[PDB]
A paper describes a structure:
Bacterial ClpB and its yeast counterpart Hsp104 are members of the Clp/Hsp100 family and function in disaggregation and refolding of protein aggregates together with Hsp70 and its co-chaperones. ClpB is composed of a N-terminal domain (ND) followed by two AAA+ domains (AAA-1 and AAA-2). An 85 Å long coil-coiled propeller, the middle domain (MD), is inserted into the small subdomain of AAA-1. The MD confers unique disaggregase ability to ClpB/Hsp104 and is required for species-specific cooperation with the DnaK-DnaJ(DnaKJ)/Hsp70-Hsp40 system.
Residue numbers in the entry: 159 to 247, 253 to 285, 294 to 323, 333 to 430, 441 to 649, 659 to 729, 732 to 858
The structure:
């Protein structure tokens, strides 16, 4: 009986109704069942990244066995999960031997479950090998594919549920969790949990991370409930203060205001208790309801008779009616204490995790979108047609006026260098994705070969991995004309399917991304134009047809033309570049203003037609930041005095007048 010591009986747990409900996973369970009765290589292995509910599938199978929804071959079978802990508490091999003995004793009525299957074979227990082929033991694996790469039984692949699936799962677990945490859970909190966990948490997987959000928020709410209310602390401190003062004076007066405040503090206190009572009641009955439901599920099993109709008709709906009567009573009675876990709570927990202010997490998206041109113009200066096209396309996408199976947007940027293409990329990344850090930059110059379409996909790939870890990002493909012909096909697959199958066979989801492609092909004809504010697109389309096939031009949302930078433009770019410096100096108490002619010097030294505004930054770094740092470290320039940037001879100088 090493099973009593070294295993947990899952069918036993399911029989007691102590297993949480399993929502979805119908096909995976059915498959596993199909494989368990397999004539050879029967036993099956659940393969998927941690937290996707492989164990959930096992428990679901157990529940089906107990409920008798499984084929006659699996009726009455027992599912036991082998625990890795109790074994290692030379004893390992002997204990495991006893386990295999016990499993060979009933010969086929017991199914063993091994989570992290690699740990058994791979601290690499060897003795397990005979029982598989001999048929002494029938087991179900749960292992990662990585570890099934290590190990290479039947392949059973457990995918990761989508947002909708996760939501259904959480809605199924909702009552159990409400009971578990002594709280109410809002459906907005559920959808917010799934959605936000999907978006912001990169490393973890669904449903698990969403469930963690829910859990933590529930803990927070619990602690908030237990704690003494604000008003009561306020009043206690206040009356203690007035007590102090009064006894020190021993004014009357205060004597009255004491008493009154003691009446109030009394009333509130009683109210507090009352509320607590209500809560407690609502929980107890809840528990009882559960115990009733489990009970009727026992009654279906062993066949009590008037029992089940008494529970179904008498007990369950009475408890159900006074439960929501208690919740509507809660609706009336609850003031000082809030038991409802909302989307706001989920937001606060994921705030704790991520570090986002969370104003962004729920800031109104429609107002963000409608004002988009302005927001993008806060960073990108000039290039009005570009911002217009991009903003319009993204608006179309978010309004749901476009194919849902394609990326949010697809743009081809055309024009010279240094005109702010990459600037608009970073601006987009910031605007929608809350950082420039959510961007994926790939130079196409380094993919010209067959080893190119190899490298970025697989044979992992530079692209697929980045998009998999960061589904919301701006994918910028620079100098796309240099690309290897095999890559363009992959690009079409992304622009169309909104997904891409890699060298490993798994599909990466691009539907949350904005795909931007830049090219210098139009640079000459564009610099040679302004021609009308319109016809340019036709003119350059002419040169587009040479290097690009109709498929590509038609599958991208907008083809963007970037104009060279005017004088006032470069001036403004300069000022924006000076903002950061201004800020860093503002922190130390320096105020800097720049002369118009000095700004002209910067604008001149920062712009040449071939590199555009690229030289500008280190034109500032060299001509301004260097002597500035010199004087700051010198002590010549002192905080609390305005620093004017003027010109001396042809060179820029800093002064305190
Ligand atoms: N279909 C489902 N129905 C209900 N809960 C699920 C489902 N899939 C996953 N879960 C939940 O996800 C949580 C973590 O899943 P888990 O089985 O630990 O993942 P894995 O074992 O595959 O790493 C579990 O608490 C489980 O309740
Ligand atoms: N339209 C613009 N708006 C704001 N900054 C710009 C603009 N054009 C150029 N710059 C500045 O010039 C630098 C280089 O420009 P960049 O966007 O990289 O050009 P390209 O997209 O052709 O590589 C950027 O860091 C940016 O600060």
């Amino acid at each position: 009986q090493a099973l009593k010591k070294y295993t947990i009986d899952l069918t036993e747990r399911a029989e007691q109704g102590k297993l949480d409900p399993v929502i979805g996973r119908d096909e995976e369970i059915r498959r596993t069942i199909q494989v368990l009765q397999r004539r050879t290589k029967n036993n099956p292995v659940l393969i998927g990244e941690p937290g996707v509910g492989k164990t959930a599938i096992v428990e679901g199978l157990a529940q089906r066995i107990i409920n008798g929804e499984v084929p006659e071959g699996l009726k009455g079978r027992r599912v036991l999960a082998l625990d890795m802990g109790a074994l290692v508490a030379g004893e390992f091999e002997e204990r495991l031997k006893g386990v295999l003995n016990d499993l060979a004793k009933q010969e086929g009525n017991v199914i063993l479950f091994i989570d992290a299957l690699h740990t058994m074979v791979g601290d690499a227990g060897n003795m397990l090998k005979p029982a598989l082929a001999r048929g002494e033991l029938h087991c179900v694996g749960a292992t990662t594919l990585d570890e099934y790469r290590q190990y290479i039984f039947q392949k059973v692949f457990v995918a990761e549920p989508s947002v909708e699936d996760t939501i259904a799962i959480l809605r199924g677990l909702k009552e159990r969790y409400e009971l578990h945490h002594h709280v109410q859970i809002t459906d907005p909190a559920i959808v917010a949990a799934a959605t936000l966990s999907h978006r912001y948490i990169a490393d973890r997987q669904l449903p698990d991370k969403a469930i963690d959000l829910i859990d933590e928020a529930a803990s927070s709410i619990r602690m908030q409930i237990d704690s003494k209310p604000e008003e009561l602390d306020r009043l206690d401190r206040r009356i203690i203060q007035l007590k102090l003062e009064q006894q020190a004076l021993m004014l009357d007066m205060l004597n009255e205001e004491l008493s009154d405040k003691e009446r109030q503090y009394s009333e509130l206190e009683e109210e507090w208790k009352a509320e607590k009572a209500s809560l407690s009641g609502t929980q107890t009955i809840k528990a009882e309801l559960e115990q009733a439901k489990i009970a009727i599920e026992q009654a279906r099993r062993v066949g009590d008779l008037a029992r089940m109709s008494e529970l179904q008709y008498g007990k369950i709906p009475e408890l159900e009616k006074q439960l929501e009567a208690a919740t509507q009573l809660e609706g009336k009675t609850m003031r000082l204490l809030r038991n409802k876990v909302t989307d706001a709570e989920i937001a606060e927990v994921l705030a704790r995790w991520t570090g986002i202010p969370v104003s962004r997490m729920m800031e109104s998206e429609r107002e963000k979108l409608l004002r988009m041109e302005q927001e993008l113009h806060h960073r990108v200066i000039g290039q009005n047609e570009a911002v217009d096209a991009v903003s319009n396309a993204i608006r179309r996408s978010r309004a749901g006026l476009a194919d849902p199976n394609r990326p949010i947007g697809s743009f081809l940027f055309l024009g010279p260098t240094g005109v702010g293409k990459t600037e608009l990329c970073k601006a987009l990344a910031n605007f929608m994705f809350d950082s420039d850090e959510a961007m994926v930059r790939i130079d196409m110059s380094e993919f010209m070969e067959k080893h190119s379409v190899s490298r970025l996909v697989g044979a992992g790939g530079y692209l697929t991995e980045a998009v998999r870890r960061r589904p919301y990002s701006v994918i910028l493909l620079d100098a796309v004309e240099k690309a290897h012909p095999d890559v363009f096909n992959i690009l079409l697959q992304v622009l169309d399917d909104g997904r891409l199958t890699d060298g490993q066979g798994r599909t990466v989801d691009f539907r949350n991304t904005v795909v931007i492609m830049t090219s210098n092909l139009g640079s000459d004809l564009i610099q040679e134009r302004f021609l009308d504010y319109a016809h340019m697109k036709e003119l350059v389309l002419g040169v587009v047809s040479h290097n690009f096939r109709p498929e590509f031009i038609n599958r991208i949302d907008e083809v963007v033309v970037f104009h060279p930078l005017g004088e006032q433009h470069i001036a403004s770019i300069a000022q924006i570049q000076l903002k950061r410096l201004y800020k860093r100096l503002e922190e130390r108490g320096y105020e800097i203003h720049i002369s118009d002619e000095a700004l002209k010097l910067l604008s001149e030294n920062g712009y040449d037609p071939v590199y555009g505004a690229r030289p500008l930054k280190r034109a500032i770094q060299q001509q301004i930041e260097n002597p500035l740092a010199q004087q700051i470290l010198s002590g010549e320039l002192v905080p609390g005095k305005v620093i004017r940037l003027e010109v001396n001879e042809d060179r820029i100088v800093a002064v305190q007048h």
